[PDB]
Symmetry: C2
Subunit: 88 residues, 2 copies
């Protein structure tokens, strides 16, 4: 279904970015930045300042290890989806 | 992008089921049941017993109003996505 296909797109997109550097199952700041700029260009403003990257990661990083793991990424998708929902 | 398209599929699918009866922005038990059986047939077992529907709703209904609103639905998608992630 469309729902099942959206679930796999979430996993696919996370894995495309998390495996580029260092830990293959987590997003460090540079991976998280490219995911936003390449895949969220219609919803979010392009990130160019280091301070914005730093702030986004602080916001998402719940277990405070400095990286975004798959749960924290899902919390981010929820925030974006919810915001979109509410706009419309 | 594939990510942006998965975000809109989440909103689209929720709205297809939440607007069938009563409150148009929430899922009551009968809407939640048909969403599962029609759209999650590859990941979840078909729901046939009332007790299973009741249990799923209790689990998802955080604000305890007996219905699944768009936030609680997003918490459900996270649980399914996460489970899929972990299986593989
Ligand atoms: Ca990584
Ligand atoms: Ca973390
Ligand atoms: Ca409804
Ligand atoms: Ca509720």
């Amino acid at each position: 279904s469309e729902l099942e296909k959206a679930v796999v797109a979430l996993i696919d997109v996370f894995h495309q970015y998390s495996g580029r550097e260092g830990d293959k199952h987590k997003l460090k700041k540079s991976e998280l930045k490219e995911l936003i700029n390449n895949e969220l260009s219609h919803f979010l403003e392009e990130i160019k300042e280091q301070e914005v990257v730093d702030k986004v990661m602080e916001t998402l990083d719940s277990d405070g290890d400095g990286e975004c793991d798959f749960q924290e990424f899902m919390a981010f998708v929820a925030m974006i989806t919810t915001a979109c929902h509410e706009f419309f």
